[PDB]
Amino acid sequence: MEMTSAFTLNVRLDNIAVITIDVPGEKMNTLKAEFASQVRAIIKQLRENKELRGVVFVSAKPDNFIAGADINMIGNCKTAQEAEALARQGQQLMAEIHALPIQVIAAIHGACLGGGLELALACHGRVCTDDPKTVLGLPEVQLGLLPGSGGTQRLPRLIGVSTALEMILTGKQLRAKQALKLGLVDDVVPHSILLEAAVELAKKERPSSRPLPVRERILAGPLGRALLFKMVGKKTEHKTQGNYPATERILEVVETGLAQGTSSGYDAEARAFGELAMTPQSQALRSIFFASTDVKKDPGSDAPPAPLNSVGILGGGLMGGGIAYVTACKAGIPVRIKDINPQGINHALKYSWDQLEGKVRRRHLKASERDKQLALISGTTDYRGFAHRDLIIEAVFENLELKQQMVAEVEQNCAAHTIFASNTSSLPIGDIAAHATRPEQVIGLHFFSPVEKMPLVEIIPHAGTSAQTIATTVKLAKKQGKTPIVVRDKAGFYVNRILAPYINEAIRMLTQGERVEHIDAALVKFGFPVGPIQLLDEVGIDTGTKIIPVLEAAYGERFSAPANVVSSILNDDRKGRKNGRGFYLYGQKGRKSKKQVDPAIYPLIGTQGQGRISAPQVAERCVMLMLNEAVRCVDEQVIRSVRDGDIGAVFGIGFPPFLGGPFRYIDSLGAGEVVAIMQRLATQYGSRFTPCERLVEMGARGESFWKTTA
Amino acid sequence: MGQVLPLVTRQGDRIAIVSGLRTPFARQATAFHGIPAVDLGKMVVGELLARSEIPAEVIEQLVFGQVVQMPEAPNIAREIVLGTGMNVHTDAYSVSRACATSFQAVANVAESLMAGTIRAGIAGGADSSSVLPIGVSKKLARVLVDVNKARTMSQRLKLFSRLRLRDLMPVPPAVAEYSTGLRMGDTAEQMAKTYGITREQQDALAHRSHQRAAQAWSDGKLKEEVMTAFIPPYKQPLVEDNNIRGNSSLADYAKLRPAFDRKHGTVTAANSTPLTDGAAAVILMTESRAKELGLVPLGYLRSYAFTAIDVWQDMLLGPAWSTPLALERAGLTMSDLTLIDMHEAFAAQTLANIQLLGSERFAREALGRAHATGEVDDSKFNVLGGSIAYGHPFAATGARMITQTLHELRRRGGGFGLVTACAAGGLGAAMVLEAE
Amino acid sequence: MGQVLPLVTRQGDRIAIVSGLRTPFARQATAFHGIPAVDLGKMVVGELLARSEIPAEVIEQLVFGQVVQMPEAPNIAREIVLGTGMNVHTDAYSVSRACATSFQAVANVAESLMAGTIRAGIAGGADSSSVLPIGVSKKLARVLVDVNKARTMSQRLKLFSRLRLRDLMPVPPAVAEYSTGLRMGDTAEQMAKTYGITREQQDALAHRSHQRAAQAWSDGKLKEEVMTAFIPPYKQPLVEDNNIRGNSSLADYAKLRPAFDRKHGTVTAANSTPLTDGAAAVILMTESRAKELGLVPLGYLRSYAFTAIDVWQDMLLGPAWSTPLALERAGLTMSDLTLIDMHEAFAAQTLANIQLLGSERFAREALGRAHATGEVDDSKFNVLGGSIAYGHPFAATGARMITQTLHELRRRGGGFGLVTACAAGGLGAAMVLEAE
Description:
Chains B, C: Pathway: Lipid metabolism; fatty acid beta-oxidation. The structure is cut from a larger assembly and holds 1 copy of chain A and 2 copies of chain B. Chain A is α/β, with parallel strands linked by helices.
């Protein structure tokens, strides 16, 4: 009640006390500033009474045990001093909790993330339910930070060095069974007896009388700790490219904690919040986290949705199998596939089968539920059985008349309630609708290839589209574990529209006599996962390139690629991995190592010149193209909100997260200042680097797309 | 009404029959190899529900059964309900009556449904002769029970001391009758000898059955009754029955060794149905329930009958006994019966059956009825071929005949079909169908 | 509207239950060692006809089911007739529904002879845990089928090349659910943990049941419905149930380590039914037929109901769901129920069920009914003990419970008995008995 906080004490008839943690506001159980104060009062009031024999912590909330520290509290920090103050106060609070002689037990149910294991690692014993919602981990390196207290030193000394550093670096998740197997949690019980199952553990005499041994004692000591740190650091820096802070700092703080003692580790971790909380990467990651949470919260539309239980797919092959797998195995909705050929249905079912049972081969699932999941996918070559489908997806070739014919015939052979969606590539949605008895129930999705890897979709209404349709589609996309984005119906849409200049300028580079390897390495070192050419070949050369004529006919010739060279590869059976031959050595005869590109692509290219351009400069030019295209499209409100565009760009293309996205990057690089040097780029190469007019105005007068708070 | 009993419900509504379905049948090694018997039924039931407009909540009970039986999951109908997508509040149920299992399932569903307790149900059968349960010797089971109950270590060694001989070898399954030791085909050899069926009198029936079945696929008339099975390897789908061989000349398989007698064995392998794998199902529903949810009924049901005879000579005469009883219960006559059907598990036995229904003496003395039950025209008999062609999954060949017969009467535009079958143990079943 | 289902034939005669009888039960690997369940059924049905003094030609159908099915005789109801002295024209068949098969057998015999197709039938069940169908590994059987189909002599070696040391080992039988992997006990353990069942009160229930069963045997009240089995070695006859341990103390119960959950579980061997062998049977007959041939009916039948529930949580709440429907159909109330009898698969599930039929909230939301079913008085609950005493032969329990319930109601005024049972797969059955 604004003073009770959440931590409430209750002494039962036995000489034990149960502590409930019920936050009056959010359904999560987060950590705020006043808790660290009032819990001291509670623990003092408990320390006065000598009648007790044990204490237990209870979530008292169906959702989670403790969600984690409130990031907004960190957001108000101003320098290293405040962060060090928070670190030190958390350290002393956990030390005080660990300082009691009586038995302290944590009963874990729901979720325990971030600072949560802090409390768990500050307790002598802990038990967790078997509810498949329970999970343990440290999701703080993801936010460009490190755990609050002791987790870098008490956890390694509790469970081992290798697993602890793997948890701290990757920030993975723990299940109840595997936490028990590893040794983190002492016992696992069903939820019903949970608190009771803790009580007798409180009654046990030994707080710590015989710590469990480590079968991985071999490396204990200075004989191998240095070697392991060197190897893991080299591995990470090669994998993370060394542009991610709060990675080597983790190794340093763990080393100093293990070698010079726990006090040294505490001091090092206080300093770690001292700087790492203020590095620009930290603000970028916190901001992108906020954006993702907001878009998950956002309902897409404002009308109430409609019931959704039946999903149909018109087309098989490979992509239709992908939509089927996502809709069935993930969202758990029955899915019905229609095709003209039994071979297509068989091929789609084979794809869904192959995608699954890989968990079975890794014992992550068993056939008992594998069969149950497959039970939701049905196939047919006729229209009977579609009469009650709530929603349907069209995923076959993009001939406009063919799509019109199918939409007509499905209007004829289905219910009026049913809504239609199309996995359109380039054809306009309104044009596809055209002759529709119920055009208001026609919408367009846009997946990618494949659909179980890239995590966002596109929702593309036309002029007449009832808000119920948008709401239903957004809720469906959410239920599939994807991030929906609503965009304005314009030629080329948003994502591939800004992706096209990337590959275009990449080919323009390649033709002017530069080795592809070092430009690829430079551009992935800038922060982009996966290089240009491998992305281009595996994504589908024809599929992605098919829109280039559409973009050219829509806006201008800036999208135009060098002629007779890309099409030369196109009509050469060198069509990427699906054709088995393209760019990189696809034979994989080099002992499954990094096979170099095929020693025939260069001769077929003009490749006149030398490297010429600096390694940073090529990446700078490409990203400037994406930035100019992004600002140009957001000028005409192709994207509903700036946050939507930023999250789409960073989260579907692979924009460097530590840069935060396009607009964080704009505000970072002096804004309009870069325009100056960017203008120079045009004067070196051509009109393709003309500044966007909105960009000119904002930069010249001095502005940010994000007034917001600053 | 001294013999006729109507099959109406308490409210006065007849027992309508709605769609059915049939997995295409395969030999015991070609496809479905390693595929258990449960998941075939799972396939057919799941995709039968996902073919009509009925929500899954209408179905209130499903009955399957299987002859070849796996020790795990004895009540396979419950796993049919659980594994597929169905309401988990359906009263799953399993029966077993040898080769007439599907007929018994349909009869149970019909009588329970006309009792008033149910308004819609599923009845069918699945069978697989490729996952044979190969049990160990009987002696090497008491030893296992004792060693499970054995208390000290020294007792176990003294127990295995009696383990000797060839008790380790597995016991092959037996198709011979439990109480007779007759191989179910050698009870047809003596029937053929007794009623004088020539290897040329038969082996023309097999030819006329392979035809009118190859022709049936080629015409595609049986397109809407057969699924397109998809197999977990998903190498290639199975669309057509592979047992059918509607290309051989009648002078090609006249040169075959006798199977059982091997001395005077006027029956052989070609003119006898082979062991196969498959499944089939039918949706039973009262007329009122079908009407009130807007569904056209695929015919109806008129009457049925089951009969037993002594298993020591000619036990395969089940249809001969069952048919007159079914006719008298339906208030009909063999004359006014457009199209009939027979199980034809073997060449002969079926021919013997026609000869018997045509014989006045048999009905005079072995049944006590005044007159013989009538002869059957060739044209109105197994129009679309028979089990000497498709195959004989033990528990599935029931419902297949109902579906095919209803569709054929749909083409002829009326009539009263009739279906009969014989089973091991001297069990015979018959029922009369009415396609409006 | 009025939801009552009167079990009457077309003429209006209600269903009667003339007599019944039960083989005394035995522990696994004891006197009934090596005796196939078909032989137990033979024993009980033959001697039941012997006592019943009715002509064997009156019986027109029998239905036995059996769990732990043996592959040699699929339709054991036929061999029951063939091996005994019953008339061969008898039309027998088999069913199978978890641990409530006998309930289903009685149900469909009743509904069949209510339809008018027959006039008298026999329903029952038999099972034996003494003999097990222990089979070889799945991979091995495929090899055997292939080598049977193998055509080249040199191909057989290339086919046997694929082998393993662990493939020769026989596969032990499994009792856990096919689709869940949970044994019957694990569901009982989690149910006890959920609703809260202290070990002390479970052991109190077990002690009460054992004391009542021993008292009943010593009084000899269960003497006219138990055989005196004779075993082919013929060393000494079996007259009494050997499972009952009527000389026991609660202190002995308290000294048992938990079986499934070896950490916090509250079920052990003492408070759970063991593996037994036995058989039972009941003769159904319409009252007109009984009157015509001069028999006194041992009660009647009033209503029945079967229900399914989800398998993942609380699989053993069958009686709770089934009982209200049975009472509603019978037009009765739990208040006006002279005796109640419930199947005691485990102490925990029994206590949980009685707790639930008193739970107003449960019937208010889970069933949708307005009010709770009622309160189970301990005085009229399991008057003669229960399955925690005699045992669980799986199939025979329903027929057994019917026999003792009718006898006990006869020992008092008329009343209305009630019998319920849970079963694996979330199947529950209930029925109401009149006994005049």
